[PDB]
Amino acid sequence: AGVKAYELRTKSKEQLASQLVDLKKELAELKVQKLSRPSLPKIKTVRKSIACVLTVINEQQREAVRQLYKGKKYQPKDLRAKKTRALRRALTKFEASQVTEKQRKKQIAFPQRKYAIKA
Amino acid sequence: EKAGHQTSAESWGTGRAVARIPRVGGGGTGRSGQGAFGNMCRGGRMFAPTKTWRKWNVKVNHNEKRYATASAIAATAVASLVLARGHRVEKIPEIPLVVSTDLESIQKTKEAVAALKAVGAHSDLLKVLKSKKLRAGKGKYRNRRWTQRRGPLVVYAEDNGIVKALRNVPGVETANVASLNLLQLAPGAHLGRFVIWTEAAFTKLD
Amino acid sequence: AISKNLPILKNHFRKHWQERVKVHFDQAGKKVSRRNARATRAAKIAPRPLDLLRPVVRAPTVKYNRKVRAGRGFTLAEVKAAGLTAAYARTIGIAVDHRRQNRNQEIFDANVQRLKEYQSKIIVFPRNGKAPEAEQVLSAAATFPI
Amino acid sequence: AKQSLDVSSDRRKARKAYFTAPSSQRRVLLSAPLSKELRAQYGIKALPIRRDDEVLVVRGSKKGQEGKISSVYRLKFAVQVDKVTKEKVNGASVPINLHPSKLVITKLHLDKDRKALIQRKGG
RNA sequence: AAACUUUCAACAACGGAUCUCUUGGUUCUCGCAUCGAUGAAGAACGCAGCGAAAUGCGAUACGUAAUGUGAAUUGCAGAAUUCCGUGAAUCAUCGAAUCUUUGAACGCACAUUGCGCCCCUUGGUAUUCCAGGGGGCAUGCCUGUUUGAGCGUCAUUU
RNA sequence: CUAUCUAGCGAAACCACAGCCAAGGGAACGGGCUUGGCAGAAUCAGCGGGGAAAGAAGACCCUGUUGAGCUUGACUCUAGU
RNA sequence: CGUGGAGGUCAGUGACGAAGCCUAGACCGUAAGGUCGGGUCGAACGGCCUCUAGUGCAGAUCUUGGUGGUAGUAGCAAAUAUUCAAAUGAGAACUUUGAAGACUGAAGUGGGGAAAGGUUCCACGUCAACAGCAGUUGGACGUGGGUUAGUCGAUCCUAAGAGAUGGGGAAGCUCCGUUUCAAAGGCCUGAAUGCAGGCCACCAUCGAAAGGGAAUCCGGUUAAGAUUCCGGAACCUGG
RNA sequence: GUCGAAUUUGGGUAUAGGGGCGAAAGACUAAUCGAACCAUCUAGUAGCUGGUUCCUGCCGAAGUUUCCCUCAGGAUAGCAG
RNA sequence: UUGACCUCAAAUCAGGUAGGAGUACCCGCUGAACUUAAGCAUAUCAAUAAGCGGAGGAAAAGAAACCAACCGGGAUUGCCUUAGUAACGGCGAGUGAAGCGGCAAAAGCUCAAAUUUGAAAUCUGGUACCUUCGGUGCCCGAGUUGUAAUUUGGAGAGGGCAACUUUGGGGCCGUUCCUUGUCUAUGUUCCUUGGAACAGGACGUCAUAGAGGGUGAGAAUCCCGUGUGGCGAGGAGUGCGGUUCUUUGUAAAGUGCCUUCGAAGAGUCGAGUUGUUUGGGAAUGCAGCUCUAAGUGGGUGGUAAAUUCCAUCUAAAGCUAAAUAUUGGCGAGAGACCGAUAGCGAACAAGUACAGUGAUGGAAAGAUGAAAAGAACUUUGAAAAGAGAGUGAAAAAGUACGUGAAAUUGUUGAAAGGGAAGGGCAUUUGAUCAGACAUGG
Ligand SMILES: NC[C@@H]1O[C@H](O[C@H]2[C@@H](O)[C@H](O[C@@H]3[C@@H](O)[C@H](N)C[C@H](N)[C@H]3O[C@H]3O[C@H](CO)[C@@H](O)[C@H](O)[C@H]3N)O[C@@H]2CO)[C@H](N)[C@@H](O)[C@@H]1O
Ligand SMILES: NC[C@@H]1O[C@H](O[C@H]2[C@@H](O)[C@H](O[C@@H]3[C@@H](O)[C@H](N)C[C@H](N)[C@H]3O[C@H]3O[C@H](CO)[C@@H](O)[C@H](O)[C@H]3N)O[C@@H]2CO)[C@H](N)[C@@H](O)[C@@H]1O
Ligand SMILES: NC[C@@H]1O[C@H](O[C@H]2[C@@H](O)[C@H](O[C@@H]3[C@@H](O)[C@H](N)C[C@H](N)[C@H]3O[C@H]3O[C@H](CO)[C@@H](O)[C@H](O)[C@H]3N)O[C@@H]2CO)[C@H](N)[C@@H](O)[C@@H]1O
Ligand SMILES: NC[C@@H]1O[C@H](O[C@H]2[C@@H](O)[C@H](O[C@@H]3[C@@H](O)[C@H](N)C[C@H](N)[C@H]3O[C@H]3O[C@H](CO)[C@@H](O)[C@H](O)[C@H]3N)O[C@@H]2CO)[C@H](N)[C@@H](O)[C@@H]1O
Ligand SMILES: NC[C@@H]1O[C@H](O[C@H]2[C@@H](O)[C@H](O[C@@H]3[C@@H](O)[C@H](N)C[C@H](N)[C@H]3O[C@H]3O[C@H](CO)[C@@H](O)[C@H](O)[C@H]3N)O[C@@H]2CO)[C@H](N)[C@@H](O)[C@@H]1O
Ligand SMILES: [Mg+2]
Ligand SMILES: [Mg+2]
Ligand SMILES: [Mg+2]
Ligand SMILES: [Mg+2]
Ligand SMILES: [Mg+2]
Ligand SMILES: [Mg+2]
Ligand SMILES: [Mg+2]
Ligand SMILES: [Mg+2]
Ligand SMILES: [Mg+2]
Ligand SMILES: [Mg+2]
Ligand SMILES: [Mg+2]
Ligand SMILES: [Mg+2]
Ligand SMILES: [Mg+2]
Ligand SMILES: [Mg+2]
Ligand SMILES: [Mg+2]
Ligand SMILES: [Mg+2]
Ligand SMILES: [Mg+2]
Ligand SMILES: [Mg+2]
Ligand SMILES: [Mg+2]
Ligand SMILES: [Mg+2]
Ligand SMILES: [Mg+2]
Ligand SMILES: [Mg+2]
Ligand SMILES: [Mg+2]
Ligand SMILES: [Mg+2]
Ligand SMILES: [Mg+2]
Ligand SMILES: [Mg+2]
Ligand SMILES: [Mg+2]
Ligand SMILES: [Mg+2]
Ligand SMILES: [Mg+2]
Ligand SMILES: [Mg+2]
Ligand SMILES: [Mg+2]
Ligand SMILES: [Mg+2]
Ligand SMILES: [Mg+2]
Ligand SMILES: [Mg+2]
Ligand SMILES: [Mg+2]
Ligand SMILES: [Mg+2]
Ligand SMILES: [Mg+2]
Ligand SMILES: [Mg+2]
Ligand SMILES: [Mg+2]
Ligand SMILES: [Mg+2]
Ligand SMILES: [Mg+2]
Ligand SMILES: [Mg+2]
Ligand SMILES: [Mg+2]
Ligand SMILES: [Mg+2]
Ligand SMILES: [Mg+2]
Ligand SMILES: [Mg+2]
Ligand SMILES: [Mg+2]
Ligand SMILES: [Mg+2]
Ligand SMILES: [Mg+2]
Ligand SMILES: [Mg+2]
Ligand SMILES: [Mg+2]
Ligand SMILES: [Mg+2]
Ligand SMILES: [Mg+2]
Ligand SMILES: [Mg+2]
Ligand SMILES: [Mg+2]
Ligand SMILES: [Mg+2]
Ligand SMILES: [Mg+2]
Ligand SMILES: [Mg+2]
Ligand SMILES: [Mg+2]
Ligand SMILES: [Mg+2]
Ligand SMILES: [Mg+2]
Ligand SMILES: [Mg+2]
Ligand SMILES: [Mg+2]
Ligand SMILES: [Mg+2]
Ligand SMILES: [Mg+2]
Ligand SMILES: [Mg+2]
Ligand SMILES: [Mg+2]
Ligand SMILES: [Mg+2]
Ligand SMILES: [Mg+2]
Ligand SMILES: [Mg+2]
Ligand SMILES: [Mg+2]
Ligand SMILES: [Mg+2]
Ligand SMILES: [Mg+2]
Ligand SMILES: [Mg+2]
Ligand SMILES: [Mg+2]
Ligand SMILES: [Mg+2]
Ligand SMILES: [Mg+2]
Ligand SMILES: [Mg+2]
Ligand SMILES: [Mg+2]
Ligand SMILES: [Mg+2]
Ligand SMILES: [Mg+2]
Ligand SMILES: [Mg+2]
Ligand SMILES: [Mg+2]
Ligand SMILES: [Mg+2]
Ligand SMILES: [Mg+2]
Ligand SMILES: [Mg+2]
Ligand SMILES: [Mg+2]
Ligand SMILES: [Mg+2]
Ligand SMILES: [Mg+2]
Ligand SMILES: [Mg+2]
Ligand SMILES: [Mg+2]
Ligand SMILES: [Mg+2]
Ligand SMILES: [Mg+2]
Ligand SMILES: [Mg+2]
Ligand SMILES: [Mg+2]
Ligand SMILES: [Mg+2]
Ligand SMILES: [Mg+2]
Ligand SMILES: [Mg+2]
Ligand SMILES: [Mg+2]
Ligand SMILES: [Mg+2]
Ligand SMILES: [Mg+2]
Ligand SMILES: [Mg+2]
Ligand SMILES: [Mg+2]
Ligand SMILES: [Mg+2]
Ligand SMILES: [Mg+2]
Ligand SMILES: [Mg+2]
Ligand SMILES: [Mg+2]
Ligand SMILES: [Mg+2]
Ligand SMILES: [Mg+2]
Ligand SMILES: [Mg+2]
Ligand SMILES: [Mg+2]
Ligand SMILES: [Mg+2]
Ligand SMILES: [Mg+2]
Ligand SMILES: [Mg+2]
Ligand SMILES: [Mg+2]
Ligand SMILES: [Mg+2]
Ligand SMILES: [Mg+2]
Ligand SMILES: [Mg+2]
Ligand SMILES: [Mg+2]
Ligand SMILES: [Mg+2]
Ligand SMILES: [Mg+2]
Ligand SMILES: [Mg+2]
Ligand SMILES: [Mg+2]
Ligand SMILES: [Mg+2]
Ligand SMILES: [Mg+2]
Ligand SMILES: [Mg+2]
Ligand SMILES: [Mg+2]
Ligand SMILES: [Mg+2]
Ligand SMILES: [Mg+2]
Ligand SMILES: [Mg+2]
Ligand SMILES: [Mg+2]
Ligand SMILES: [Mg+2]
Ligand SMILES: [Mg+2]
Ligand SMILES: [Mg+2]
Ligand SMILES: [Mg+2]
Ligand SMILES: [Mg+2]
Ligand SMILES: [Mg+2]
Ligand SMILES: [Mg+2]
Ligand SMILES: [Mg+2]
Ligand SMILES: [Mg+2]
Ligand SMILES: [Mg+2]
Ligand SMILES: [Mg+2]
Ligand SMILES: [Mg+2]
Ligand SMILES: [Mg+2]
Ligand SMILES: [Mg+2]
Ligand SMILES: [Mg+2]
Ligand SMILES: [Mg+2]
Ligand SMILES: [Mg+2]
Ligand SMILES: [Mg+2]
Ligand SMILES: [Mg+2]
Ligand SMILES: [Mg+2]
Ligand SMILES: [Mg+2]
Ligand SMILES: [Mg+2]
Ligand SMILES: [Mg+2]
Ligand SMILES: [Mg+2]
Ligand SMILES: [Mg+2]
Ligand SMILES: [Mg+2]
Ligand SMILES: [Mg+2]
Ligand SMILES: [Mg+2]
Ligand SMILES: [Mg+2]
Ligand SMILES: [Mg+2]
Ligand SMILES: [Mg+2]
Ligand SMILES: [Mg+2]
Ligand SMILES: [Mg+2]
Ligand SMILES: [Mg+2]
Ligand SMILES: [Mg+2]
Ligand SMILES: [Mg+2]
């Protein structure tokens, strides 16, 4: 039951804030009835919903902070490439590309010649 | 290598009224005190443990290799051998069976099958259909569950699709006359493979 | 110990030899994969024949000096005597060896001959991609034997 | 035989694969053949069996019996139909596990992507 | 003659040989090249309607998002079974997050759930004192920056 | 208080096979072999003659081109000096 | 002669019963062994020709596992001691209660704590195992309950001692060193916060539940907690 | 035996294996000390004990020679297949 | 008084980086003994184990201060062979490489020392601005104690001269590659046994599919697959062919000829000595201390020295693919392997339960049946259970569960028995088995 990922993404922050609070109100009230009854399997879907609400609220604020940093040279390490320690310190495609002026002319003067031999 | 040798076990020495074999340290578990290393003791190391560098492949002289493949062919001419080797060539017009080279182009099974049956290979075909049986040993779970006889050897010059046509038939195998494997020629080192030749193949032999 | 009448052997196996032991079980797969490694080179390399032209060289000492052998590269004298520069002679696939000077004419002749005669049977494609369809010969040395 | 360097014929991994197959993959191993009628109409031999399919037992001591699929028990590699039940001597009735391959589907419960599957298969 | 003892048989015990099983081991080959201060490896404690393990996870806790898939999961219960459907599932996939207390482990400690300092914000009169919330302060080194020291030292003094 | 008898509970040592002698010869001190004495179910409490009784691959002794603790103008070295 | 596996072959055997096992039953072989019947059994297995080995057991104070005689035997005898009745229970020398007889005799068989254990505490259920007789009982089994602090501890301080830091060794893991051959700071004031005041400056930290130390008592209360809860009366530090 | 001091003792702390510690016994250093405990080198070497797995058929020994830091072992010739 | 400079500090200065894990392979350091020598010290084990520092997907080595002595050869690595050879060795035990030759793979290279000196032409950052692995403009910083171009010995530079040759940067379809989805054959006919047909018989079918697994027993055709082809979706990215641009070029490269010039690495090479190592022997490498070069110089040329020549390379600075390594990691395919005392220790809640203060030590243990149909109900019992009765193909499968051996044990039956028992030959007695019976009714 409970909440749905796409429906939440439309609602505004300040509504989500209140969404949560009455889910916490419910889940709290659940745990009361829970110990007065022969179990209560129902409480699973609301505590999962709280995760979803909180996932979305996170999605927004992260994306929002993603915008505020767009195009800039220095972005929070939270939001960076990840990939690999070893990887992300490898030379950039630019840095590996550089070639000494002596060579760039040698790489022009006599670059590899495609040929063949018939008969 | 590590087998049966992963442990600290020392001997206990004489004087404990216990055999001198190495025995396991510590306590608190049945393993402690038990016999270690050694072939006689459970959980130990096997005597003279098998090595990979055991000599597996065997070298043969090339001329002697061809001498084997040669007689192996000549036996396919002898009616009594091929008969004795367990092949159903009982009737059939003549040995050798040489067949129309059009065979080499047959690309579909139902054709290639009835092609052989009509040239007189039907009886040693049906054989291999009736010889499939569960394997005798534990090789059953070693990826050989089944054991069957040998159908005829269909030998060509060029492969125009006879190979794909007979690749699914139970017991027939196909070979170029340029190669001619002795294993196929004398299965079990048994002379007299029943061999169906194509005229193109047969005229190539010399 | 020492018994009967037998030649004295020397078997160097006191050393933990069973540690460093190489079987080659891979001789099959190290060939099958040695082929596929060459097969797709020539694929990626397109009409070019997998190897440089290699010179004719005398080979040394008092034992193998009788025969003649493929050397490393064509050296310097023969490259200009073939009418082209070093730096270009490597672009058309040819072996250039800057050491090994020429102390022998009969070889120097045959080698420069081996160059022009190579330059003959080739076809060297232009800057562009418009070229005469290029059937690929894989061998070079066996196309220009010695 | 297998011509591919991908498929293996090794008996061990095969039985590992069957028994460790997940629920998604089991659903396909739980395919059932289609009845002479349903074969005609849809031009399709077999489809993964699913719940509410009416069915006909083609094998076993229940052969020639009919009912609707009560549940597909994928955990079990088995299937339950109503009307086919053991009555234990305590008076209770108990569902009898049957195999999809020993069943034939006499009516398909269809929805959109069950339709679109019958179409997605050529035939 | 019994009892007793011994030997044999039958049935019954004791025990798990043997036979047949094999989601395991073992060895050969083939292909690929990716751990970590963006917090790894490893550890601790937790997390399910009913779990002690194994397994999975991290207070969003046997999982949240995304994608596919097309109806189950199943020990009982429960459901919304929300089935021509943005949709079942202990499914596959995984590109988005969460990720307690730790650990090279970074304010200082650490047989302690011990103890400082800085910044923002909320409540208690509140610049100060107490409390809640949020973010912070390791080392060596490089490049840069800002601020300094030295009759090491060149000019200017006026 | 034990032992002893009973209800209940219930081990261990050891074990080639076993268990009456005399002599004989015998690896020169036999439960077994040879010749004699003999020889009758099933058993309980005691006992310390035998079982060359049990305990532990003799420590004494010798052997081993097997050690170790130790000593010294043995052989060969060495920190320090 | 026999065993595991391998190529070949009998189109060999078999759910109408393979293999195994049991047979004071049969036959063959000098023998290793082979063959058959009967029983029990449940899914595989054999003959011949070859190949190949982790291929044949009575011992090794062999290894592991199982089992005997010993044997219903040695034993269940230290710590003065038990008895009558009831209740409960299928069942009582052993449980509960009553009574009688006794003991430890406060340097205790009393009343608390430290280390250590870790729920053993308490209550209800409950006796297969465990309590070397017994068990209706238990420190067992099952299910639950339970440990409340400004003042009692920890926390703070320093002890023997340990240990970073400039540094100096060492190939290095690392060693030395604790004020040393170091530019080692952090207070109170005014002008909401920087400059102007200004003193002062050998020195991380860890190290005591028995050392040092801020400060609580009585009465009541639970099945099980109390200098902690409640009622009343106080005190100490910090605002 | 000693029992008001070279007394008994808790806890904290220090010294570690050719090392410690010793009012000295080769004592003690976790039931381990004339060199701890743990793993590895290690399946250490053994001229020395012990064991060494089916049947039948034929042939059939030696304890002597010489050399050996050789005397419980080898080489060597002899006997044997 | 004010402004720089050198050097040296500080900051919770702005941006970063190192640590740890892993360790099969890889580069180094350090470093044994057991052992062999039938003793033992050199030697051997071994330039090994243990200990330490540093990497990658490979590492390393590499464009020769090489090998040779030939008609010479020509970076490196690996295979084959040199070769159990040369040599080392109480010349004992033992040790032991190299040059050539065949093959695998092949790939070459750049700095330092030169005045741009008619122009620091070089570069880090900050910053706005965009087309963001970056691009421009501006600005602080670096730097003349040397940033750029140019040159690397195979050269090559300056001049002098004389003609011919040659180009750049973007992306827009398709291919290849990685992720990844999906389509693509043929009996469930008859009979018989059985609980179950997957069995045997009958009649068929498909096969570029008769690998394998699943399903109530030996299943090509019941299911998943297998074989052959076909169609999507998302990714890299410059290789392969195809697009059309831009105009790189008031740049760059190639090549001819004359004459002059041609910088080439020091507490290094080399040496002495010490130690160690090596097959390296009057000294193979390595390092300590001491000495310390030259520039037609220097190193090597495997017997030390003087002398005379000859041969061949250019140290003391640097980068690089492939062939090569791989008891680790990830993903696969296999075997004349092992079959629960085997095979890894672990087929299982196995590095677990348990032991130790600690480092460490470290097990046992798979199988009811097709399916729980897991024995309703009656009955004796305090109860655990027993007895009926049910399920099942079977209970001679009942969660002590497939088959159920031996030791050992209970009952029943048979026989024997005066201080063991068992064995050989023979026979009485009993029990028990047999082979031999068809020729006229
Ligand atoms: N087959 C029994 C063997 O017992 C061995 O283990 C046993 C031994 O280690 C040890 O047995 C000792 C024995 O070593 C020593 N030499 C004599 C001693 N009397 C024995 O004792 C053992 O056996 C006796 C006799 O049955 C029993 O009465 C006794 O209870 C038992 N502990 O006690 C263990 C348990 O009996 C091994 N597990 C294995 O070799 C094998 O299982
Ligand atoms: N004689 C009629 C023909 O038999 C042919 O084939 C015969 C067999 O080969 C086939 O039976 C199967 C077969 O389907 C499959 N592809 C192979 C399998 N081994 C065969 O199995 C057969 O042989 C085994 C022994 O091997 C025997 O037990 C039994 O006869 C049978 N099960 O079925 C037939 C029975 O003998 C075809 N079915 C067809 O051409 C036609 O029916
Ligand atoms: N100061 C160093 C920096 O710390 C940063 O990390 C900051 C936080 O993310 C980190 O927070 C830690 C957290 O890691 C951890 N899992 C939970 C913990 N409570 C937090 O701890 C922080 O606050 C506590 C308060 O009691 C302090 O005791 C602790 O020293 C401090 N690190 O503590 C830092 C702030 O004190 C970054 N990891 C990095 O840039 C760098 O290492
Ligand atoms: N010494 C006479 C000859 O000089 C020649 O000198 C070379 C160069 O100096 C000469 O000059 C080339 C010129 O060819 C070409 N077409 C134009 C190019 N800019 C020049 O290039 C040269 O000169 C520039 C200055 O202009 C310098 O930076 C530098 O020396 C070089 N790049 O081109 C020659 C190419 O090899 C060669 N070294 C050789 O032929 C011979 O020695
Ligand atoms: N007695 C009535 C009920 O029996 C039930 O139990 C039934 C079974 O589980 C139990 O089975 C027992 C078994 O437990 C035990 N291990 C022994 C035996 N294998 C079985 O025995 C049973 O089956 C046999 C065979 O037909 C009958 O002869 C016998 O009477 C019967 N008790 O026997 C019972 C049937 O008589 C439950 N225990 C309970 O509901 C109640 O006691
Ligand atoms: Mg083992
Ligand atoms: Mg003994
Ligand atoms: Mg066909
Ligand atoms: Mg087998
Ligand atoms: Mg078998
Ligand atoms: Mg297997
Ligand atoms: Mg198999
Ligand atoms: Mg090549
Ligand atoms: Mg697959
Ligand atoms: Mg395998
Ligand atoms: Mg009922
Ligand atoms: Mg099933
Ligand atoms: Mg859809
Ligand atoms: Mg459509
Ligand atoms: Mg079975
Ligand atoms: Mg509950
Ligand atoms: Mg789970
Ligand atoms: Mg349900
Ligand atoms: Mg249900
Ligand atoms: Mg999943
Ligand atoms: Mg995830
Ligand atoms: Mg974390
Ligand atoms: Mg942390
Ligand atoms: Mg910390
Ligand atoms: Mg905070
Ligand atoms: Mg007595
Ligand atoms: Mg008694
Ligand atoms: Mg006792
Ligand atoms: Mg005992
Ligand atoms: Mg005793
Ligand atoms: Mg006398
Ligand atoms: Mg006598
Ligand atoms: Mg006497
Ligand atoms: Mg006597
Ligand atoms: Mg005796
Ligand atoms: Mg006798
Ligand atoms: Mg006699
Ligand atoms: Mg006499
Ligand atoms: Mg006596
Ligand atoms: Mg005795
Ligand atoms: Mg004793
Ligand atoms: Mg003793
Ligand atoms: Mg002795
Ligand atoms: Mg002894
Ligand atoms: Mg003694
Ligand atoms: Mg002596
Ligand atoms: Mg001697
Ligand atoms: Mg000694
Ligand atoms: Mg065999
Ligand atoms: Mg085997
Ligand atoms: Mg076979
Ligand atoms: Mg066979
Ligand atoms: Mg049959
Ligand atoms: Mg068998
Ligand atoms: Mg018999
Ligand atoms: Mg029978
Ligand atoms: Mg039986
Ligand atoms: Mg049988
Ligand atoms: Mg079965
Ligand atoms: Mg079966
Ligand atoms: Mg063996
Ligand atoms: Mg055996
Ligand atoms: Mg035995
Ligand atoms: Mg024995
Ligand atoms: Mg016993
Ligand atoms: Mg007895
Ligand atoms: Mg008793
Ligand atoms: Mg008694
Ligand atoms: Mg006693
Ligand atoms: Mg008493
Ligand atoms: Mg009473
Ligand atoms: Mg009592
Ligand atoms: Mg008294
Ligand atoms: Mg007192
Ligand atoms: Mg108390
Ligand atoms: Mg209690
Ligand atoms: Mg107890
Ligand atoms: Mg008791
Ligand atoms: Mg009892
Ligand atoms: Mg206090
Ligand atoms: Mg403190
Ligand atoms: Mg101090
Ligand atoms: Mg220190
Ligand atoms: Mg100092
Ligand atoms: Mg300030
Ligand atoms: Mg105190
Ligand atoms: Mg109390
Ligand atoms: Mg109060
Ligand atoms: Mg005295
Ligand atoms: Mg006195
Ligand atoms: Mg040590
Ligand atoms: Mg010593
Ligand atoms: Mg010391
Ligand atoms: Mg003393
Ligand atoms: Mg003494
Ligand atoms: Mg001990
Ligand atoms: Mg001790
Ligand atoms: Mg000693
Ligand atoms: Mg110790
Ligand atoms: Mg210990
Ligand atoms: Mg051994
Ligand atoms: Mg060794
Ligand atoms: Mg030896
Ligand atoms: Mg001796
Ligand atoms: Mg001598
Ligand atoms: Mg002897
Ligand atoms: Mg900063
Ligand atoms: Mg590291
Ligand atoms: Mg390392
Ligand atoms: Mg020796
Ligand atoms: Mg020796
Ligand atoms: Mg010695
Ligand atoms: Mg050495
Ligand atoms: Mg090492
Ligand atoms: Mg890496
Ligand atoms: Mg590679
Ligand atoms: Mg490299
Ligand atoms: Mg060079
Ligand atoms: Mg070379
Ligand atoms: Mg030497
Ligand atoms: Mg000598
Ligand atoms: Mg020698
Ligand atoms: Mg050596
Ligand atoms: Mg060497
Ligand atoms: Mg810039
Ligand atoms: Mg910039
Ligand atoms: Mg040109
Ligand atoms: Mg049928
Ligand atoms: Mg099957
Ligand atoms: Mg059939
Ligand atoms: Mg199959
Ligand atoms: Mg199959
Ligand atoms: Mg199919
Ligand atoms: Mg299909
Ligand atoms: Mg397919
Ligand atoms: Mg140089
Ligand atoms: Mg060294
Ligand atoms: Mg030297
Ligand atoms: Mg390099
Ligand atoms: Mg490279
Ligand atoms: Mg391996
Ligand atoms: Mg490893
Ligand atoms: Mg393969
Ligand atoms: Mg077993
Ligand atoms: Mg095992
Ligand atoms: Mg077992
Ligand atoms: Mg076994
Ligand atoms: Mg085995
Ligand atoms: Mg084990
Ligand atoms: Mg356990
Ligand atoms: Mg241990
Ligand atoms: Mg079992
Ligand atoms: Mg009743
Ligand atoms: Mg009752
Ligand atoms: Mg019954
Ligand atoms: Mg039932
Ligand atoms: Mg029935
Ligand atoms: Mg039956
Ligand atoms: Mg049965
Ligand atoms: Mg059964
Ligand atoms: Mg049951
Ligand atoms: Mg049970
Ligand atoms: Mg049992
Ligand atoms: Mg059973
Ligand atoms: Mg079974
Ligand atoms: Mg039995
Ligand atoms: Mg008597």
Question: How far is it, in rounded angstroms, from Cα A18 to Cα A89?
Answer: 44
Query: Residue A78 belongs to what H/E stretch?
Result: none
Is B119:B196 a contact under the CB 8 Å cutoff?
yes
CA–C1' distance B138–I339 (Å)? Answer: 8
Distance spanning both ends of chain D, measured CA to CA = 26
Question: How far is it, in rounded angstroms, from Cα C136 to Cα B83?
Answer: 52
For residue B33, which atom of ligand 1 is closest to its CA? 9
- In chain B, which residue's Cα lies nearest the Cα of C21? B53
Tell me the nt nearest to C27, Cα to C1'. E29
Measure CA D19 to chain center. Answer: 16
H runs (alpha helix) in B7-145: 62-75, 79-84, 109-116, 123-130
Structure tokens at B181: 């494997």
What are the CB-based long-range contacts (under 8 Å, 24+) for B29-33?
Answer: none
Q: Which residues of C touch A111 (CB under 8 A)?
A: 91
Rounded to 5°, the CA angle B7-B12-B15 comes to 170
Is B129:B170 a contact under the CB 8 Å cutoff?
yes
Question: How far is it, in rounded angstroms, from Cα D114 to Cα C81?
Answer: 79
Ligand 2 in contact with B114 (CB < 6 A)? no
Question: How far is it, in rounded angstroms, from Cα B206 to Cα C30?
Answer: 35
Query: Strand I within 7 Å of which CB atoms in B 8-67?
Result: 8-9, 24-32, 42-44, 46, 50
Q: Which of B5, B53, B55 to mutate to test the interface with C (most CBs of C within 10 A)?
A: B53
Is D30:D76 a contact under the CB 8 Å cutoff?
no
Kindly list the distances between the CA atom of residue C7 and the CA atoms of B35, C1, C14, in Å, as whole numbers in the listed order.
43, 13, 20
Is D13:D93 a contact under the CB 8 Å cutoff?
no
Tell me the nt nearest to B2, Cα to C1'. I344
Structure tokens at C96: 């250039």
Q: Give the closest-approach CA distance of C20 to chain B in angstroms.
A: 12
- In chain D, which residue's Cα lies nearest the Cα of B145? D11
CA–C1' distance A104–I137 (Å)? Answer: 27
CA–C1' distance B14–F70 (Å)? Answer: 27
Question: How far is it, in rounded angstroms, from Cα C107 to Cα C102?
Answer: 8
Burial of A116 (0-12, 13-18, 19+ CB in 10 A): buried
Query: Strand E within 7 Å of which CB atoms in D 83-102?
Result: none
Strand partners, D85: D95
CA–C1' distance B175–I284 (Å)? Answer: 60
Query: Strand E within 7 Å of which CB atoms in C 22-41?
Result: 23-26, 28-30, 32-33, 36
SS3 at position D57: strand
What resolution in angstrom units was achieved for this structure? 3.3
Q: Which residues of B touch D11 (CB under 8 A)?
A: 141, 143, 145
**Residue appearing with tokens 């030379």:** A91
Nearest to B195 by CA among B30, B49, B77: B77
- Helices H / strands E in chain C, number of each: 4, 1
Measure CA D51 to chain center. Answer: 10
Question: How far is it, in rounded angstroms, from Cα A32 to Cα A39?
Answer: 11
Measure CA B156 to chain center. Answer: 23
Q: Cβ neighbours of residue C72 under 8 Å, at least 6 residues apart?
A: C54, C55, C57, C95, C97, C100
Method used to solve the structure: X-ray
Question: How far is it, in rounded angstroms, from Cα C104 to Cα C106?
Answer: 6
Nearest to B199 by CA among B107, B105, B126: B105
Nearest CA to ligand 2 atom 16: B129
B176 C-beta less than 7 Å away from strand G = no
Ligand 1 in contact with B17 (CB < 6 A)? yes
Question: How far is it, in rounded angstroms, from Cα D13 to Cα D20?
Answer: 10
Rounded to 5°, the CA angle B178-B183-B188 comes to 155
Nearest ligand to the C-alpha atom of residue D114: 18
Please choose from B109, B129, B148 the residue to mutate so as to test ligand 2's pocket, defined by most ligand atoms within 8 A of CB. Answer: B129
Q: Which nucleotides of strand F lie within 7 A of protein CB?
A: 14, 55-58
For chains D and A, having 3+ Cβ pairs within 8 Å is answered: no
Question: How far is it, in rounded angstroms, from Cα B11 to Cα B19?
Answer: 9
Question: How far is it, in rounded angstroms, from Cα B180 to Cα B202?
Answer: 12
Measure CA D28 to chain center. Answer: 8
Question: How far is it, in rounded angstroms, from Cα C135 to Cα B14?
Answer: 83
For chains A and B, having 3+ Cβ pairs within 8 Å is answered: no
Q: Which residues of B touch C18 (CB under 8 A)?
A: 51
DSSP D99: -
